[PDB]
Amino acid sequence: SAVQQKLAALEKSSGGRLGVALIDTADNTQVLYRGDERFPMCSTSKVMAAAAVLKQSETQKQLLNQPVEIKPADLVNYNPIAEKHVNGTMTLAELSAAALQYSDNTAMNKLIAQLGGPGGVTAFARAIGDETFRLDRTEPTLNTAIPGDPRDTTTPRAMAQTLRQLTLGHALGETQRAQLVTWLKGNTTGAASIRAGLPTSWTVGDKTGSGDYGTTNDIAVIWPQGRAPLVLVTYFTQPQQNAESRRDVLASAARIIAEGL
């Protein structure tokens, strides 16, 4: 198609490997580029950890208010929010918001621990029908993004269908889904990625991710005005271990998707 031609040209211009999955909920049509190839998820995996805790709270009705201790030994490499509460507590709601809206890596590890380890996050993916997602490590080693390493990867198609079910479907209860949507819409890290390629008028909720090998990711639910929502996943990784992040590639992919409605 035309969009596949331009996405292929974008990739060629960039020197990296680009993966895209779009779901248009209006007719359940899909646009895919390298949709079945594995990409390192990096921080986009935080969406699944938060979703898994939200699912837990459908039964444990007060779980999100449960306080969790933040101690100096919990701090890893990027802890913008948890640092503000060392030697205090944060609730699981506050930890989920920090992981999602600020990509706090300590918050992610607390969520992994609440679920019983990386296998508890992966188990949730399987329980909603995602047989591709795999979380293997905690923060920060899950970001090594080594070429060919299947650990901590998913595919664009799989992540698009899962993100659809979590935010617009009913994988979660009603109050839980609305909380996830509210959280994604208030992300602070995404201004230069998918958002930068879309009309200023559309509402976006997204989660970014970055890691070694110049890995630059963004997953998003998009609410155009007067139009059914869209789900867009953009994954990007590069051949050199020390390559720079390329958020512009993600904005460009989104702009190519958007021009063709």
How far apart are the C-alpha atoms of 197 and 253, rounded to whole Å? 7
Q: Which of these, 135, 138, 66, lies nearest to 96 by C-alpha position?
A: 66
What is the rounded (10 degree) CA torsion for 74, 75, 76, 82? 120
What is the rounded (10 degree) CA torsion for 38, 208, 203, 261? -30
Grouping H, G, I as helix, E, B as strand and the rest as coil, residue 120 is: helix
The resolution, in angstroms to one decimal, equals: 1.5
How far apart are the C-alpha atoms of 214 and 83, rounded to whole Å? 26
**Domain 2-260 classified CATH 3.40.710.10?**
yes
How far apart are the C-alpha atoms of 92 and 261, rounded to whole Å? 38
Two structure tokens written together for 6 = 């331009």
Residue 229: how many other CB atoms lie within 10 Å: 18
18, β-bridge pairs: 236
Please state the domain extents for the chain. 2-260
Cβ neighbours for 62, distance < 8 A, ≥ 6 positions apart: none
Residues in the chain: 261
Q: Which of these, 60, 83, 89, lies nearest to 176 by C-alpha position?
A: 60
| Residues labelled catalytic | 43
How far apart are the C-alpha atoms of 214 and 238, rounded to whole Å? 5
CB 224 within 8 A of CB 230: yes
How far apart are the C-alpha atoms of 102 and 167, rounded to whole Å? 19
Measured between alpha carbons, how far is residue 142 from residues 3, 59, 158, 164 in Å?
A: 32, 30, 19, 24
SS3 content of the chain, % helix, strand, coil (to 5): 45, 20, 35
How far apart are the C-alpha atoms of 80 and 78, rounded to whole Å? 6
Single-letter code of the amino acid located at 188: T
